[model samples]
Target chain A: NRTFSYTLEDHTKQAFGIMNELRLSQQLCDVTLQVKYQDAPAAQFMAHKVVLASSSPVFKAMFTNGLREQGMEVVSIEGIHPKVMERLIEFAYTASISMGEKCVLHVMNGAVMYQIDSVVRACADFLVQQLD
Target chain B: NRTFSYTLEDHTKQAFGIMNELRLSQQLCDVTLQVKYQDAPAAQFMAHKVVLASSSPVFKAMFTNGLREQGMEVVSIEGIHPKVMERLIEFAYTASISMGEKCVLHVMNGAVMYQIDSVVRACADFLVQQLD
Candidate 1:
C-alpha cells in the first residue's frame, strides 16, 4: 500500500509518475493507494469572487461524456471539505475490512485528483482492465 | 453522430458496443457525442424511501477518491434534474461553438452514464491515452 497526495492541478503529473513507474515494473501487484488526511488550524476564510456556481447540465453532460469516452467510470461525485472526507475513508476501510473485499482507495479533494485517481484504479484492477 | 438515451444502467453496454465498433475503424476520428433532452408534461413525483442526503464529507471524500483512482476527471458534479440539465447543455454547446472547441457531449443523469462516458472520452483521445 502507498499513499500520496497533491492538489488538483499537478495530480495528473503525480498519476503520470506513478503509472510510468508501475508500468516499468512487473512486481508491483496488489497495491493499495491511500489519500491521507491533513489537519490544520483555520488560518483565514477566503472566498473567490465571481464563482460560477455554474450548475450547467449541458456542461456536466459533455464533461461526463468526454470522460466516459476516455474509459473511466465515475461511481460517485460530491462536494465535501477535508474533515468530512476523512470520515469516509474510515467507513470505506471498515467496509473493506468487514466484507473481506480487497478494495483499496485513492482519495483527493477537487476535480483533478478525484478524476485521475479514478483512472488509476480502473487501470490497476485486472478485472476492470478487461472491460477497458 | 448518433443519438441514444436510456436510464443509466444499460448505457455501459451501449458504450461498449460503440467502443467495439470504433476499435475496428480509423476513420471515426472526428465524431461528436451528444446527450439530447426531452420535454415531458408534469408527472407525479414520488420521493425515495430513505434519501440519504448522506451529506458526509468523508463519504464524499472517499467517493471522490475512488473515482479519481479509477481515472475519470470530475469537471462538474451537480445533483440537478432533467430540466436544469438541459439548460447546462445549451450553455456547453454555446461555449463550444463560441470557443471553437471540437466538443461533443454524452449526457446521463446518474452514475453509470456519467462515469462510463468519462472513461470513453479519455480512451478516444490520443493525448489522454498515453497517460492511461
Candidate 2:
C-alpha cells in the first residue's frame, strides 16, 4: 500500500529544545546578575544578563541603558526573596514556573511585575484550574 | 478548604519558550555561520555559534577548535541546502522540526550526521507514525 500516516512537525519544538539545553549548560553565559533578598546578603543568585535582558523589559532597560548594572559584574535585586527570585529567574531564563499554593500568588505577582505574559497565563491558568 | 492543586512545572517548557522567542528575535546573535548549497554562493544562511555549539557536537567542535572558522567571522557549510540547513539550525536553537516526505530523509540524515538525538528521535517517530 502506497500510503503513509505522518504528523507535521512544529518548527518551534526543535528550537526550544536547544534553548532549554543552553539554559542548563550555562557555560557561555556572561555578566552574572545578583538578586539580593532583603538582609540575606549571602543569598545571592547568579544569572546571565544577555538571557535576562532578552526576556524582561526591566532587564532589557537595565542592561541596554548606561545604568550601573551595565558595567557592574553583579547587579543586585531588591524586594523579592531568594526563593521567589529563584522562580522568577527560572521563568526568565527557562520560561517555567512551578509554584505551590504557598507561592503561586507570589509568582503571579512577579510575573505581572515583570510583564512575562507566558508565566502570567500559566499562573492564571493554574489559579483558575484551582477554582474547579 | 485551604488546598492547592498544583503540578510541578516542567522546566524545559519555559526555557524552550524563551529559546523560541530568541530564535525569532535573532537580534543578539554575534557570529553568522553560512551554509551554501551546491554552486549557490548567494544561497547563504546565518546563525549564532553559541546556540549551535550547545546543540550539535559538530558545531561544538568547529567553534571550539582553533579552526579557520574561529578567525573568520563567517563559517561556510557545504552539502546541505539552505532549506535543510534552516530546518537543522531551527532544531538546534528552537528544538522544533517540521518536515514532509520530501525532506524527512534529508533531515534524518543530517540529524544522524550531526548526532542530534532529539531531532533524530523526532524524525524517527515521525517516520514510524507514517507507517501507521
Candidate 3:
C-alpha cells in the first residue's frame, strides 16, 4: 500500500507560524515612533507657519527586516510642500491596499496605499493652473 | 422589584465599535498606493541612481478630515536627503509609540507620527557635521 498525505505547501500555516515568531520577536525587541511640532513666523514675522516632526529608531533585532531593507528617505523638513503632501498620499495608497493575490485570498486590506503621490501631483498641477 | 437591563460601556467594546465603524467607512471608500521608480544615469551614464515613485487620489468622501484638519507637510521627492531621513526617523519614533496613557490601556499603536522643522533642522546640522 502506498499513501501520500502531503498536499500543496500550507502558506497560511506557514504564515501563522511566522506571525507567532514575529510576536515573540516584537516582545524581545522594541520599535518606536516619536512625534514633535513647532511654529514659526514667516518672513518679516508677519505670518506664522506650523510644522510637525516625527521619527523612529530602526532596530535590526526585530523581524521587520523587509521594511528596514527598503532603507528610508525623506527626513524632517522645514515645511511640507503640496507635492510632498501628494507624495504622502501616494505612499499611503500603496501601503493601504492589498496585493491582487492577497485580495483573492480574502485578506482584509488596510487603508494606506502606494499611489497617493499621483493624487498630490495632479492636484498640485491643477492648483498651479488655478493660480496661473 | 423591577429591573431593566442596563448596558455598560466597555472601553474595549467602544473601541471595537469605533474600529468597526471606521472599517465600514474604509470599506465604502477607496484608497491605494502606487510605486514608480526612475533610473537615471549620473553625469553621462558614468553612475546610476534610482528613485521610487508613489502617488494617489484625494477623495473627500473618506472621513479622514482629521488628518487634513491637522495639515501635514513633506511628501515624495528627488531623493531621501539626510535631514529628511533623520526627521522621518523621529516621526516614526513617535508614531510607533502610543500616547503612553493609551498604551497603558493595552491599545496597539500604529506607525506614523507628527513632528516639526526646528528639530529636523537640528538633525540636519548633525548630519552635515557627519558629512564634514
Top candidate when judged by DockQ against the true structure:
2
Off by over 4 Å in 2: A1-25, A42-76, A92-105, A118-132, B1-21, B42-44, B48-57, B60-74, B93-104, B118-132
Question: Candidate 1 docking category?
Answer: incorrect
Report, for every candidate in turn, its global Cα lDDT versus the true structure: 0.25, 0.59, 0.22
DockQ-based ranking = 2, 1, 3
- Chain A TM-score, each candidate: 0.17, 0.66, 0.22
* lDDT ranking from best candidate downward: 2, 1, 3
Each candidate: how many clashes? Answer: 44, 15, 68
Cα displacement (angstroms), candidate 2, residue A86, comes to: 1.1
| Model 3 / residue A45 / CA error / Å | 36
**Interface RMSD (Å), each candidate?**
21.8, 7.6, 23.7
Regions of candidate 1 where Cα sits further than 4 Å from its true position:
A1-132, B1-66, B69-81, B96-132
B12-110: candidate 2 lDDT, tens digit per residue? 445445544655665334356577677766454455555676677787666555322311256766777777777877765555667667577778888
Please identify which of the two predictions, 1 or 2, would achieve the higher DockQ against the true structure.
2
Which ranges in model 3 have alpha carbons more than 4 Å from their true place? Answer: A1-132, B1-31, B40-119
The deviation in Å at residue B10 for candidate 1 is 37
